[PDB]
Amino acid sequence: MKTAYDVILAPVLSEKAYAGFAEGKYTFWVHPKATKTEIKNAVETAFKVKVVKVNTLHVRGKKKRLGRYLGKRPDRKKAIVQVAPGQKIEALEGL
Amino acid sequence: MRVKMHVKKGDTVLVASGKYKGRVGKVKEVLPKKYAVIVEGVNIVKKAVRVSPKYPQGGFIEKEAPLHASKVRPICPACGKPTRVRKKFLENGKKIRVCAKCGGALD
Amino acid sequence: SKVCEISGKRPIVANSIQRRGKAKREGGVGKKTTGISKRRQYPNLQKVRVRVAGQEITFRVAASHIPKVYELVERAKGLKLEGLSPKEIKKELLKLL
Amino acid sequence: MKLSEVRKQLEEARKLSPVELEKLVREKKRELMELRFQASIGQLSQNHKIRDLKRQIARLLTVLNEKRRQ
């Protein structure tokens, strides 16, 4: 059955995602089929926050090889949610 | 369906062929995939090891080599002789391995 | 150039044979075929429009079975048909086939 | 997860109402996400726990589906 924890996969662990913690923009990897509105509700019921702004982008899987064998990494999608003034998602503040 | 094993960890077996013919040992491990067993203190090989956290200073280590399962025979914990294995149906009616020389259980 | 709704008469394939000479029967050397090719012999379809339950129904029918369209109309008197479309009525007639 | 514990999970699972089942899944689904996050930062050495929870959620839903289907 579909829940919020099915929509949010893992947080984005990179120098650029960290920079957004300062201003309350958190960055998660999300399921590629999930809508902005869908991602809003999900982060909200997951972390008890108020989502004011959601920006999403797709990330192509990098093509890689093992000697003889050419292949592709799974395609991903990340979302950057803006929580309300003063709010925080502590789990990601982690760091 | 599954490989037939007349021997298992860790009943006692005679090595009846090869360089260790006649030795007796416990079945340390059974590798059904390769159809081979590991018999304690039998088939010792010298393997080289790189200097590591595992083996600093390094050099060599002694290891037991796998033996073709056919080269090994279980010993009867009753009569004490090397034997072939039979099967026997109990009243349960589960089946057990039994010695062919005497009717001993072999577990 | 098509199919008889009543009889199923269809276009068929026939040969057109070309012959020279005098038949043996009339004292001749014999008939030689100077050509054969395929051709089609079509049914003789015509339109048959009849009014049935106050509706206009039309049939594509080989001339041979033209009166068979009327026998249907005659047989169609025992059926409650009024109010239907011509498409439906035609199906009902054809069921009497 | 242990065999005996599986049987035990099933007995107690089959006694729940759908709603209790639905609620139970949601939590174990939430725990899966919690596991995934720590897995991300290399802070989950007992990684077998991930496979384990996935199958619990599976076993629950299978039973949720049991409850509804006849």
Place this chain on the structure above:
RNA sequence: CUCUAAGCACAACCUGCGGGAACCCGUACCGCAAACCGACACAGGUGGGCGGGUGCAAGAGCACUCAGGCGCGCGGGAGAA
């Protein structure tokens, strides 16, 4: 924008103000080219817009030069036919 028809005229529409709501896909990099079409890091081919200054009658011509970009992925000598 306007006109009316079924309808509806506690509805409906227009205007002003407020609060709320606003999804999916693209966006990296080359792009007159070593990243496109030509089997090649190929003197070929590829649509649109910007394209400064001075001088030469004009100009998108021509010479030099701005910003910007390059010296073209083998070199060193010799000084014959």
Place this chain on the structure above:
RNA sequence: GAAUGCCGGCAUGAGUAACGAUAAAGAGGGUGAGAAUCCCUCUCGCCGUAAGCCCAAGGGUUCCUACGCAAUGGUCGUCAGCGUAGGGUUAGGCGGGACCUAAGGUGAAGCCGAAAGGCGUAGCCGAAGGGCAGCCGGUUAAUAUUCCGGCCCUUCCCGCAG
């Protein structure tokens, strides 16, 4: 043993022709096992209705960074559009869709054809045409009319007033 036979391997021509625009180089300094060939500086030369810059097509990670040099690079290589890894593409207003139609395509009604199928007013699809609301600056190694700053605007839902 021959079929200008077939598949493969290895010779000869031969250290020969060539190394792909005659825009052009020189030195110093640095790095490194190794440097004409990578980085840095200075000097010299070439393009400038381009050999600069921005869009569309097409290509599809080639982008940025770290670590590398077997092969790819017509030489060399410490460099690279190359190997490994990690990072990177953020929109109600830009482009396309939730709008419109063009040739054409498809196609209720209807017509036609052995079968397969061919047609066909309406409608539907179809765009680089019509239509529609964002401008300037800052920030990143790498994105920006997308994030941030400032000042603006659009549609939809509900309410209130006229």
Place this chain on the structure above:
RNA sequence: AGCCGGUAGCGGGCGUGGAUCCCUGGAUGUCCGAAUGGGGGAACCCGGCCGGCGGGAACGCCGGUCACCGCGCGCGCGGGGGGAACCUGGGGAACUGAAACAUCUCAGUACCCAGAGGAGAGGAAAGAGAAAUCGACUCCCUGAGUAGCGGCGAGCGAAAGGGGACCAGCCUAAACCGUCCGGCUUGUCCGGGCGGGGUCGUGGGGCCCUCGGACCGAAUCCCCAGCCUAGCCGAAGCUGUUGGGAAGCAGCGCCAGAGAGGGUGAAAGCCCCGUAGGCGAAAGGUGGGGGGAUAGGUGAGGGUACCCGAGUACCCCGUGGUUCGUGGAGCCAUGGGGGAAUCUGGGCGGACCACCGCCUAAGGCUAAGUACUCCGGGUGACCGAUAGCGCACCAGUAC
């Protein structure tokens, strides 16, 4: 009794409270695809209705539902598409052969299309054709390269009969009777439904009189055996010697309904896996065999002359099929034209006529014996990496 696939490693777990694994049934099954809410450049996009989720009216997500066509009184059942060959049907070449070429051949082949199905077609005589005879059909052998066909060239090429495989026969239409329904030209009406009756070639049936009053039995259904989809039991050897290694050699034994074959450090009946001989299914599939039910099946005379499949038979024109190419050209089929009869009817026995026989057209169905090999197994005087499938290897791939 090990296990977490090929796959070891890091990092962690599971199993005699029966894991891994194998078989059966079930659950889940994103998106596209017949693809079916609509659109579309397949795997993307966009909607209606009902119900749910969020603060939720806008926005979004979840669940269900919504294409078209056919048949049957909005609702139901069905249809669609795929499958290596095999099958039927609707279309249908050419090279080539004729030592040129046109009739002819290749060949109703290749191929296209439509439909079937585990098969398909065909099938219970309007047959054969001379036997005073046979008796559905299919399939093999023979008949026979015969009879014939043929620019009587090249070539093409049957059937009856005989030997076999298998075996099986049925349901309707019409007369007449009954009932529901509707028509307008009111009933002894015409017609359409459903039921009863009826199914034949020694002709049969309907109707009317006389007499006569349980055996069969499915191709349907149910049960069962048997089989398939995992499996299990399974006789008999030790010591020495050479050698890295015994299964070689030596010595002394032993099994055999098992001495097929593969393995194990070399060459093993007795070490392993097997083999001979046996055993095995809760579940699903099958079930042509065994049992049982059910549908269905069943008299004889005399009279009557009601019925016995229509644009049909039949004749003529144009063709195809057959061995038959226009030939003395019948037969079967039918595109055009003309156009009957119901047993004192009609077709056939190679123009036609007579005599003599055979057969019952114009409705439908029907196992088995036959074809093929995507798939599983068994066996080779079959290949052994240029061979064998294009592929022994991550191949319909790279290119």
